Design a binder for these strands. Structure first.
Lengths: 170, 197, 106, 102, 137
RNA sequence: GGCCAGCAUCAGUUUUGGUGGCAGGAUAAAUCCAUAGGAAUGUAGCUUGCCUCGGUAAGUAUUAUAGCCUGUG
RNA sequence: AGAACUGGCGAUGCGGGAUGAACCGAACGUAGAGUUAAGGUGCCGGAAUACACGCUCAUCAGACACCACAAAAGGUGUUAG
RNA sequence: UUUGCUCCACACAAUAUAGAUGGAUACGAAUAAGGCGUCCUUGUGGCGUCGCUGAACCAUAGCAGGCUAGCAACGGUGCACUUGGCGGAAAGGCCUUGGGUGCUUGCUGGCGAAUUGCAAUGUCAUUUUGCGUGGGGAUAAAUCAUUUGUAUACGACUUAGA
């Protein structure tokens, strides 16, 4: 769905003789609130020895985009599970917001490398501030000055089943 | 919206045309399809020949007469692809195929009337550019239709007769548009413009 | 003068049906010139009549009429359900059926 | 009794005074003034009917003339309004009544 | 006559400042100016005078209009609004024939039945003068 | 007082619209306006192979005869 | 060929898998309106030739669990790493 | 065959309908291209202009469309006629010349409409016949029985006979 980027904060358990466990925050991409709490324990159990019954979640926050109408180049580090063993991948997306860029990534992974939602891990999504350090080629070609490209051979969608005009393109 | 609708067959795909025709026949509209020999099939030529040959060998072993009749004419090829879509064994399917008439070329009286096209079945709107297609008129010549040297000759006779009509029609519209232009600026013309005509 | 039509013509498509089972009590009616169900909200509750001819005259007329009405919308293409008093004879798949304009909501 | 009371006028288009059901009627937008018209004496009991082809009581015909004489003078002010009421209505081809503003 | 007659094949091509028309969506028939092209199929549009909010759109939902004007790449809404007035494209749009055709079928839908009668009586009068002017010359 | 119907005002169930008032969050985020920095896919200006009546040239030059980014308010 | 726990068929229709004792939904008085399950929406065939990002050209392409097909290993064919 | 048959217009019965209810309204080609307009040095020319849907165009007022008085035009259209062409793919139609006759809402008037009672398709088409009116027109073959053997299980086939 429309992903929403969430901050989840976790505090293991207040016990006698160990007060104040430190605190643990993460940034989670999930389609709603309830998945992001469950996606939180999926990673945080891998990092150190906790459980959901030995845990509680402090607070959740919805992180909006800082600047939607600005156009950003994004470099995304991705770890994912293949049919063979897992291996890393670095990909670059040009998009409008952070949370819309992950939308175009999962579609890109499912198209080319046939990876569903459960196999992919999102390592770090970063904005590349300066230009001319863009590594990939297919992102780089839009950075040329005075870029103008035509859209030839446009089709037309007409509601009536019969048209009399012998219809023509552009 | 009209009693009998005449579909021009040129530049369409076999399947995507026959789908939208078969729904109109079951809804009661009468459709007559002309210029069948200009119909197109997606995919390259050598494919669609072999899709015909593996069909061509399928016939009843103990008596070849009783088997699938392999028709060759481009109207008959197209009428096949439509016949599989209508439920032709019931009484509803027999009365739905009596509303259909498919011809090679344009025979009289259908040359005097308007021909139409179907935008969701045009080749030039459907396929991507740089993609091989196949002309059905060449295809039936490769599997035994001994009439492409005749139907194409009658079209060259027709189009000369049709070009004389259009020049007479275009000069008459020139007189009307000139008469309509000088009829403008009158008080009856300006009141129409306010109302939008 | 040349025209007298005070109704919107429409075809009888089919019965309400599953893949193998139909329900003859609900009829499906296509209305000409109607694309979307937001336009189909206009014709809800309008009166429908199927007009046909027969040889034997009943009460001075060879012409006979079944009545009915529109109940609800159907599908995304503006197809329209309909219920009659006595259901349509199922020889009428693809037959012109009249949709009148009364009862007028305007 | 929930009916509407309408007049043609009788001279314009041949429609006399008549009770008409409100639901069987499309209402347009164009209006004429009705202030000068006497109508009030008409009620449900007036139209109760309770080979001969007897002529419409003389009470019926005289009331028709009095109502219309006040009403024609209202019609004559706007252009084409006498011609508009006289001609009938039909649905031509390509007239889609849900889109048609009446 | 030693010249190369090679055709041009003129095209409306996307750029910064190509004003467009949004056919479907929330906006539904409003003008807007492309601010920055994102990739092959998405752009970033804004029209402040018409009323469309600044948003990213797919190129499927938009149609290209031949009018252009000078505007820097990546401009904000205040800067597009100032360049919009200097070109005066809202006056240049209605001069085009394609804007008049939009307004005409809008007016023909709003015609009252009495006005639909007045359209009839005038066209009966207009065809009388034409058929006299025709069939003499 | 049989038969088939039409319209009103209600009751039970239910679908499809319009439209008004309020609550919460980074007391939404942005756009918008005020300032402080900074860069280029480098605007004005300027140097120069330059010079088809002045385009190009590729350097300079951080808002001027275009504007954008980041922080704060 | 012989066992273990639970469900089912046998005794049981109905909707879906074209077809099917065992799979999927769901278990049956006679009827009317309403919404859904599993499954599906080019046409047969009721229902979007709906929207959105990509990939793939096959001189035997491919199309949906149970299920009616396939192996290693090769291929400057193409794509992303 | 007790005057049979054929065609032309009408008179009335009979019988049907896969489904009339303003109008099936004619270039071809290309789609990384064209339609139209105009000019020239007529060409793969110059220039202007349009598309981005038929949501168009055309037709459309009167008792299911009456009876009448004008005005300006010399038009439009219905009808039988007629002078000519043209069309063979399933021509079975498309034009055009000339008068004749009604109509005209291009413009302005005067009369008529009710009672079908608050809606009940409120019937107006197009197919096959049948039976009589009056108006033309044309006066035949096949099988069986008989016979031939180029034929043949029997039918069939091929022959001959006023």
């Amino acid at each position: 769905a429309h992903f929403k980027e969430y901050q989840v904060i976790g505090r293991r358990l207040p016990t006698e003789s160990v007060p104040e466990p430190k605190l643990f925050r993460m940034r989670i991409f999930a389609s709603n609130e309830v998945i992001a709490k469950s996606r939180y324990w999926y990673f945080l159990q891998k990092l150190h020895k906790v459980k959901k019954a030995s845990g509680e979640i402090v607070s959740i926050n919805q992180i909006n985009e800082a600047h939607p109408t600005k156009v950003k180049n994004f470099g995304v580090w991705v770890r994912y599970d293949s049919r063979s063993g897992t291996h890393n991948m670095y990909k670059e997306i040009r998009d409008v917001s952070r949370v819309a860029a992950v939308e175009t990534l999962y579609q890109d992974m499912a198209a080319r490398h046939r990876a569903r939602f459960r196999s992919i891990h999102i390592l770090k999504v970063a904005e590349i501030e300066k230009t001319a350090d863009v590594k990939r080629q297919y992102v780089k070609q839009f950075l040329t000055k005075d870029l103008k490209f035509p859209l030839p051979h446009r089709v037309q969608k007409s509601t009536k089943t019969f048209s009399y005009k012998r219809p023509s393109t552009f | 919206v009209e009693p009998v609708v005449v579909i021009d067959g040129k530049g369409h795909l076999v399947g995507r045309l026959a789908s939208v025709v078969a729904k109109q026949l079951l809804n009661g509209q009468k459709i007559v399809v002309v210029r069948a020999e200009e119909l197109n099939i997606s995919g390259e030529f050598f494919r669609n020949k072999l899709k015909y040959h593996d069909f061509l060998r399928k016939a009843t072993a103990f008596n070849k007469t009783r088997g699938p009749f392999h028709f060759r004419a481009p109207s008959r090829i197209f009428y096949k692809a439509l016949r599989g879509m209508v439920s032709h064994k019931t009484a509803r399917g027999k009365a739905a195929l009596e509303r259909l008439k498919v011809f090679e070329g344009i025979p009289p009286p259908y040359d005097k009337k308007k021909r139409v096209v179907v935008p969701q079945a045009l080749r030039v709107l459907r396929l991507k550019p740089g993609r091989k297609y196949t002309t059905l008129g060449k295809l039936s010549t490769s599997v035994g239709w001994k009439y492409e040297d005749v139907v194409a000759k009658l079209e060259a006779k027709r189009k000369v007769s049709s070009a004389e009509y259009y020049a007479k029609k275009r000069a008459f519209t020139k007189k009307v548009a000139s008469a309509n232009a000088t009829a403008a600026e009158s008080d009856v013309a300006k009141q129409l413009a306010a109302l939008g005509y | 003068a040349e025209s007298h039509r005070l109704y919107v013509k429409g075809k009888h498509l089919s019965y309400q049906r599953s893949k193998r089972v139909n329900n003859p009590n609900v009829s499906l009616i296509k209305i000409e010139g109607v694309a979307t169900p937001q336009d189909a909200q206009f014709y809800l509750g309008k009166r429908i009549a199927y007009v046909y001819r027969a040889s034997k005259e009943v009460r001075g007329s060879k012409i006979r009429v079944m009545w009915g009405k529109v109940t609800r919308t159907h599908g995304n293409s503006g197809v329209v359900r309909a219920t009659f008093r006595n259901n349509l004879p199922a020889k009428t798949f693809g037959a012109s059926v009249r949709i009148f304009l009364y009862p007028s909501n305007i | 009794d929930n009916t509407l009371l309408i007049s043609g006028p009788f001279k314009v288009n041949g429609v006399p005074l008549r009770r008409v059901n409100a639901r069987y009627v499309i209402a347009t937008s164009t209006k004429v003034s009705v202030e000068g018209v006497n109508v009030e004496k008409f009620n449900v009991e007036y139209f109760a009917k309770e080979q001969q082809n007897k002529e419409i009581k003389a009470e019926r015909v005289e009331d028709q003339k009095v109502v219309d004489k006040a009403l024609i003078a209202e019609i004559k002010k706007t252009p084409l309004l006498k011609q508009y009421l006289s001609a009938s209505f039909s649905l031509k081809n390509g007239d889609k009544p849900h889109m048609l503003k009446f | 006559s030693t010249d190369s007659i090679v055709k041009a094949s003129n095209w409306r091509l996307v750029e910064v400042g190509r004003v467009v028309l949004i056919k479907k969506g929330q906006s539904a028939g409003k003008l807007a100016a492309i601010v920055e092209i994102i990739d092959q199929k998405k752009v970033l549009i804004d029209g402040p005078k018409a009323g469309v909010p600044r948003q990213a759109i797919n190129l499927g939902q938009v149609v290209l209009t031949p009018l252009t004007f000078a505007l820097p790449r990546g401009a904000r809404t205040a800067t597009v609004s100032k360049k919009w007035a200097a070109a005066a494209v809202c006056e240049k749009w209605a001069a085009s024939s394609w804007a008049k055709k939009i307004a005409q079928r809008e007016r023909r839908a709003a015609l009252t039945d009495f006005e639909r009668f007045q359209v009839m009586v005038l066209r009966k009068q207009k065809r009388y003068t034409v058929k006299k002017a025709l069939a003499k010359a």
